[PDB]
């Protein structure tokens, strides 16, 4: 049975106006800005952008990849597919 989301989990993350996007739940570094309550820091692969999202926009990667893990025209998307498949826990700093 599923647990709550935790840093390191891989997802497709949904934002208004964008396709479901390969992403991870990030850690928050010491001294770094924390997310709002009930929100997680999402690191989007490919773009390497962060946004704060709740579980309603987070689709676990293993269950979702056959649907959402397909090339997309949008900038950064296909780089993002490579990252989540090939080195999803690397530093992209």
What do you see in this structure?
Belongs to the HDGF family. Residues 7-64 form the PWWP domain. It is found in: Nucleus; Cytoplasm. It comes from Homo sapiens. By secondary structure, this protein is an alpha+beta fold. It is built from 2 helices and 5 strands, in the order E-E-E-E-E-H-H. The chain is globular.
How would you describe the shape?
A: globular
Radius of gyration over all CA atoms, rounded: 12 Å
* Tally of separate domains: 1
* Derived structural class: alpha+beta
Within the largest sheet, what's the order of strands? 4-3-2-1-5
The share of residues in extended strands comes to 15-25%
What's the total number of strands? 5
Distance between the termini: 33 Å
**Largest sheet, strands/sense/barrel:** 5 strands, antiparallel
Could you tell me the CATH topology label: SH3 type barrels
Q: Give the second-level CATH assignment, the architecture.
A: Roll
Regarding CATH, which class? Mainly Beta
The SSE order reads EEEEEHH
Number of helices, counting only DSSP H or I runs of 4 residues or more: 2
| Helix content bin | 10-25%
PDB class: gene regulation
Keywords: Inhibitor, Fragment screening, Epigenetic reader, methyllysine, pwwp, Diamond Light Source, I04-1, PanDDA, XChem, gene regulation
Assembly: monomeric
Entry title: PanDDA analysis group deposition -- Crystal structure of HRP-2 PWWP domain in complex with Z54226006
């Amino acid at each position: 049975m599923p647990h709550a989301f935790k840093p390191g989990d891989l997802v497709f993350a949904k934002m208004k106006g964008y396709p479901h996007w390969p992403a991870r739940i990030d850690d928050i570094a010491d001294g770094a800005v924390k997310p709002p309550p009930n929100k997680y820091p999402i690191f989007f692969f490919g773009t390497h952008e962060t946004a704060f999202l709740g579980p309603k926009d987070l689709f676990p990667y293993d269950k979702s990849k056959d649907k959402y893990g397909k090339p997309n025209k949008r900038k950064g998307f296909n780089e993002g597919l490579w990252e989540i498949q090939n080195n999803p826990h690397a530093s992209y700093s």
